[PDB]
Amino acid sequence: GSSGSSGMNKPLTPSTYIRNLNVGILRKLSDFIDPQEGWKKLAVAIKKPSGDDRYNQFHIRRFEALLQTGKSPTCELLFDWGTTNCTVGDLVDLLVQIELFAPATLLLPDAVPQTVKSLPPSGPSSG
What we know:
Structural class: mainly alpha
Entry title: Solution structure of the DEATH domain of Interleukin-1 receptor-associated kinase4 (IRAK4) from Mus musculus
Order of helices and strands: HHHHHH
Largest sheet: none
Helix content: 40-55%
CATH architecture: Orthogonal Bundle
CATH superfamily: Death Domain, Fas
PDB class: transferase
Assembly: monomeric
Strand content: under 5%
CATH class: Mainly Alpha
Name: interleukin-1 receptor-associated kinase 4
Distance between the termini: 24 Å
Shape: globular
Keywords: DEATH domain, Structural genomics, RIKEN Structural Genomics/Proteomics Initiative, rsgi, transferase
Radius of gyration: 16 Å
């Protein structure tokens, strides 16, 4: 069993910068982007306005050193890319481009064309 169908509050917003996102959301993203080489896919999908590849293999090895020791490459990438000047909507956009509809939806469940969403279950226990 189980039921609920409450909702907490609205997400972040597509024009908020990546680094502005809270560490909890950075963890939630790392949950989904750390596997599947999701962060590599995001990194290499990030072009400059002109089209220059922001992050080539030279810097991918840098992020790999993180995953190879236990730092998330997701968090570092997302955090660093914040200083490049990109946003949640920038992220969603690219996340769709790499087939990463789960984290796209988590951020912005409307901005991803696949009709799929879910409520997370509920339990305000105390103690």
